[PDB]
Amino acid sequence: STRLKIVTIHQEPFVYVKPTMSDGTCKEEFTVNGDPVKKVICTGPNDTSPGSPRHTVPQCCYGFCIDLLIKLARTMNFTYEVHLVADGKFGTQERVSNKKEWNGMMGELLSGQADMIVAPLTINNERAQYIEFSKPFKYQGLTILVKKGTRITGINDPRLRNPSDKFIYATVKQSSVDIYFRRQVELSTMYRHMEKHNYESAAEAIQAVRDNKLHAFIWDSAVLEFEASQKCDLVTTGELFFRSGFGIGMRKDSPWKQNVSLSILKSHENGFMEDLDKTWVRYQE
Amino acid sequence: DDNHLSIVTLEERPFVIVEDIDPLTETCVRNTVPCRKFVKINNSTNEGMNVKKCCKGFCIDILKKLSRTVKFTYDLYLVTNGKHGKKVNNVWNGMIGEVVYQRAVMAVGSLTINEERSEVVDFSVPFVETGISVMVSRGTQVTGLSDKKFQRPHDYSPPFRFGTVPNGSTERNIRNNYPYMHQYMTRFNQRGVEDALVSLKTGKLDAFIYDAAVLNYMARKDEGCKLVTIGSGYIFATTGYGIALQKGSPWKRQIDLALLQFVGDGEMEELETLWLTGIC
Ligand SMILES: N[C@@H](CCC(=O)O)C(=O)O
């Protein structure tokens, strides 16, 4: 038929993004088990600043989600080409005008720029109205990343719930967390604080916590727990205050959607998913 | 009519709890809903009678929310042909079988999503996280399901004594993944969760392997906080409970959006606090 267009996003440890070598190939490296790291060529914008042109260059992609893609493609016998989402975002629906539009990977999937989203993409009601999610390939939730020494009890801490400019917290723009805080009226005090400070990417937010420019970063525990395990000047605090899962994203009329979900279930059941967790997620402490 | 659905469930506390109806006024009260159970007259006849009972619990509250949000009514009944679901000579029994054979439009309960069931029914999004956990007395040195004490039990003298409740998703997983473990374990099959906890507490079993959501609850409720799940409640083969619907069901889309709405609005957290808390 046709190769599937896969869209993904930079998000360690699920998707690492590195330059190609001079010859346009990806350097051969080996996991902490000694096995070769599987890499794919992924095209994506050379300039990631806001309001800038998005002309693309080939890059190298690897990680939990790329291992999962490779397994899915082998199981269901499709070929593919991977690219990084042009606007750098996961995807929310915003008012334009009385129209609404999806940005991020969501907008690319709905417009046909992608045929499948393979990424740490949170399953939620807002997105499921428009696309098909697989059964979750990862169960996780939200937690809070702070600089080591910062003491906040969790999501009910008064420095979050009664905020001021003395303690700044934030999440990633146009993400599922943005949606979560915008949706629940009981969180509106926090949402209004965060809208002044939200970051364009998780990596920029995490760096800002390290630089003491952001006092708390509210984000996916699968990512934040990994960050804390590698950067010992960072810690999570408060434990999961919400639970959510990541799923493969497809258009509602995709022919692949039944077997994608069955393969995810099979991989949880036979230990393949746990092997990916051992390889990419938990192995440091 | 087309809005009034046959729905099957199965007792498994605290997700589904069954109570006798008041002989007067033969009405279910408080937080409960009517649920019927077919009871045989004797074992020499196919004659039986539906008995009116009352049902409550975490999954019953989910069903109530779904009925209100998706706008259906229902006639809830308790499965009597098996339990959650097992394929026997290529024929499904239990809650899964009721859906496959079109006696129920959906199954609501502590029903684990797995691959082989998904071949014959559709599942909603998972609405409770689960998988396989291991309950032991506090301090027991087992790393997980892959501990050698489980995978190669006769490499230890005396061998570790461990079992599950047969014929559900946990046994199916162990049978497929760990054949030696599985054939060793069946001598320690437990008739149910309550028997298994007694076996642990009295030292007749060293470990009980079972559904994570139920085991983590039982650990929170254990008298004396002596029985724990390993890894502070670690879960192998992560999955969830799902609503089972007939393949191609017209109800699946709205059920999925409703469950996702409940999660996103925090309504699931209050059900967890209402049904699933304990001292430990
Ligand atoms: N929830 C399980 C039953 C208990 C178990 O086998 O862990 C099932 O749906 O089969």
Author numbering:
A (entry chain A): 3 to 98, 101 to 289
B (entry chain B): 5 to 284
What does the published report state?
Near the PPDA-binding pocket in the GluN2A LBD, the primary sequences across the GluN2A-D subunits are mostly identical except for four residues, GluN2A-Ala414, Lys738, Gly740, and Arg741, which are Arg, Met, Arg, and Lys residues in GluN2D, respectively (yellow residues and arrows in the sequence alignment). We therefore attempted to use GluN2A-4m LBD as a structural mimic of GluN2D LBD and a tool to capture antagonist binding by GluN2D. Here, we found that GluN2A-4m LBD protein can be recombinantly expressed, purified, and co-crystallized with GluN1 LBD protein in the presence of Gly and l-glutamate as in the case of GluN1–GluN2A LBD heterodimers. The asymmetric unit contained one GluN1–GluN2A-4m LBD heterodimer assembled in the back-to-back orientation nearly identical to that observed in the previous GluN1–GluN2A LBD structures. GluN2A-4m and GluN2D LBDs had nearly identical overall fold with a minor difference in the Loop1 region. More importantly, residues around the l-glutamate binding site are in similar orientations to those of GluN2D (RMSD 0.115 Å over 7 residues/53 atoms). Only minor differences in side chain orientations of GluN2A-4m Arg740 and Lys741 were observed compared with the equivalent residues in GluN2D (GluN2D-Arg765 and Lys766). Hence, the structural comparison verified that the GluN2A-4m LBD serves as a valid GluN2D LBD structural proxy suitable for studying binding of agonists and competitive antagonists. The GluN2A-4m showed drastically increased l-glutamate potency (EC50 = 0.61 ± 0.07 µM) compared with GluN2A (EC50 = 5.91 ± 0.77 µM) although not to the equal level of GluN2D (EC50 = 0.17 ± 0.01 µM). Nevertheless, the GluN2A-4m mutant mostly but not fully recaptures GluN2D-like functional properties including high l-glutamate potency as well as selectivity of UBP791 and UBP1700 over GluN2A/2B.
N-Methyl-D-aspartate receptors (NMDARs) belong to the ionotropic glutamate receptor (iGluR) family and are ligand-gated ion channels that mediate the majority of excitatory synaptic transmission in the central nervous system. NMDARs function as heterotetramers composed of GluN1 subunits (with eight splice variants 1a-4a, 1b-4b) and GluN2A/2B/2C/2D and/or GluN3A/3B subunits. Hence, GluN1/GluN2 NMDAR activation requires binding of both Gly and l-glutamate, whereas GluN1/GluN3 NMDAR activation requires only Gly. Each receptor subunit has a modular build with an amino-terminal domain (ATD), a ligand-binding domain (LBD), a transmembrane domain (TMD), and a carboxyl-terminal domain (CTD).
